[PDB]
Amino acid sequence: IINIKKEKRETDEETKQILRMLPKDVSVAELLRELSLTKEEELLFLQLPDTLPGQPPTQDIAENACTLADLTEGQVGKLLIRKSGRVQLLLGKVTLDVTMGTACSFLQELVSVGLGDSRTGEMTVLGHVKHKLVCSPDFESLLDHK
């Protein structure tokens, strides 16, 4: 029998129904094992808030939503890891917090679909997505500030 086409159990984390013979991680330890324990690159999928703490640069306006489509390239923020497991994101004067999202176990393939021509395009499989992050505004600090 082929080993890479066996039947799969309902539990996606325990699909090994037949054999030849997981604790909930935290973002700080995740980055630590991704950088210190190994050096291989990893594709992440983080969810940013609706409005970023910035202004669309010369985008013809209004206090509208400021997403990544309006910002330019270069360094836009820093990722800080404090003690006791705090994972913050300094995007300027404010500091958001990054937490672990829903632990997805199904296949997530991040691909690049580039329509270079109006008749034929190229689909480029960039990699696989395993972990999901969630970035949220630190409303407590924003409230105690003013």
């Binding site: 890479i4 360094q75 890891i81 679909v113 696989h128």
Partner: protein, 46 residues
């Protein structure tokens, strides 16, 4: 709780802003992938 270590920087890229799609299979676990499955075509609309 000071930021002792792991002061990672965040960069932004706009090269594939309009060409990046996310394909997820709700019925296929992450263990088995479609790398070995020969694909034939993909229909799509802008």
């Amino acid at each position: 709780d000071d930021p002792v270590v792991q002061e990672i920087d965040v960069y932004l890229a706009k090269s594939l802003a309009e060409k990046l799609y996310l394909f997820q299979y709700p019925v296929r676990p992450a263990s088995m992938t479609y790398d070995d499955i020969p694909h034939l075509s993909a229909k799509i609309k802008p």
